[PDB]
Design a protein around this ligand. Structure first.
Ligand code: CA
Ligand code: ZN
Ligand code: ZN
Ligand code: ZN
Ligand code: ZN
Length: 349
């Protein structure tokens, strides 16, 4: 029985963490690329996670299946299309989906990811093919989807390029820029490539989210807000370790993109402690609930709502309040945001 059988808004989910295992198998076979299993079940057992690992152990799953997907025009469009299909099944009326265009390319990307042979699919092609699948998906399945392009903490040399892509494909599907990767890298938030990309974002009306405070380091959250000028924080559980910063961000109405089930499996949240989202709820903070990587976490949006309802005593009206906040904090042009908001109001009546 679904925890929240009403319209939801999702703001934090990775496209490459939300591929169908049967679709991976299909393209592995078609392209003659090796995979450690030949069935959905076995592939799920390998890439899926039943128990907490860690940041690196989570990220390690991508190497199994990304060679099958990256560099194939047909595959890139299809996962985007199928992303919409499966999200539509989760009672989501509006999704923002994020990815690194560089990680799906096999051309004009230095260094080359996934041990790929140099081909002809550029980062620009990737964004184009994803736009195509998300746009076709939106028409076919009746829900609204927009994209977010990701900078990588360890590759600031790609960030200005991520900004250029955001600018070229503004509103045709891209609404924002993200920053992913290892937040424990000393001063990665300050690398000139990220700093200037995020400065250029402000200048160009490209919206801004940043992964920070997922595993620790409240200072990285402060860096995201004060230096990169982010509008939402991805995760941000460890912001509560600096009470003065958490207090300020509460007053400034900062949005926290919360991924409860993810935080457990990545080991970001120690299960013996109470989840940060409990403080967010009690403080009436601005936050959303999100799947993050449903493939690795074997989850749907209901996983994360079930979790909060059962273990953390979340109510119908808290689920309603946070989805309204997620809408208000969405990266839509004002008029589309009003529409989304008005739809939520009537269905929560
Ligand atoms: Ca962290
Ligand atoms: Zn086999
Ligand atoms: Zn087998
Ligand atoms: Zn090309
Ligand atoms: Zn994430």
């Amino acid at each position: 029985t679904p925890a929240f059988n009403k319209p939801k808004v999702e703001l934090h989910v990775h496209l490459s963490g939300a591929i169908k295992p049967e679709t991976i198998l299909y393209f592995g076979k078609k392209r003659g690329i090796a995979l450690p299993a030949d069935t959905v079940e076995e592939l799920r057992n390998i890439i899926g996670m039943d128990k907490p690992l860690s940041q690196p152990g989570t990220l390690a799953k991508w190497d199994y299946y990304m060679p099958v997907i990256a560099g194939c025009r047909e595959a890139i469009k299809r996962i985007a299309y199928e992303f919409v299909e499966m999200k539509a099944k989760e009672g989501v009326v509006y999704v923002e989906v994020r990815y690194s265009p560089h990680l799906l390319a096999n051309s004009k990307v230095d260094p080359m990811p996934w041990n790929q042979t140099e081909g002809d699919v550029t980062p620009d092609d990737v964004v184009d093919l994803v736009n195509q699948g998300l746009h076709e998906g939106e028409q076919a399945f009746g829900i609204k989807v927009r994209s977010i392009l990701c900078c990588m903490r360890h590759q600031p040399s790609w960030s200005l390029e991520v900004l250029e892509l955001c600018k070229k494909y503004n509103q045709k599907t891209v609404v924002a820029m993200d920053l992913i990767g290892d937040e424990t890298i000393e001063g990665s938030s300050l690398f000139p490539g990220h700093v200037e990309a995020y400065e250029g974002a402000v200048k160009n009306g490209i919206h801004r989210t940043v992964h920070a405070g997922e595993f620790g380091s409240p200072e990285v959250v402060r860096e995201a807000v004060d230096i990169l000028k982010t509008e939402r924080v991805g995760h941000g559980y460890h912001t509560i370790e600096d009470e003065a910063l958490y207090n300020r961000l509460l007053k400034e109405n900062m949005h926290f993109e919360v991924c409860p089930w993810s935080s457990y499996l990545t080991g970001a949240w120690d299960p013996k402690t109470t989840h940060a989202v409990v403080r967010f709820k009690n403080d009436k903070a601005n936050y959303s609930l999100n799947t993050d990587a449903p493939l690795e976490f074997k989850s749907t949006l209901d996983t994360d709502y079930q979790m909060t309802k059962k273990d953390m005593g979340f109510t119908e009206e808290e689920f309603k309040r946070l989805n309204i906040n997620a809408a208000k904090s969405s990266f839509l042009p004002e008029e589309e945001k009003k529409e989304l908001l008005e739809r939520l109001y009537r269905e929560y009546q």
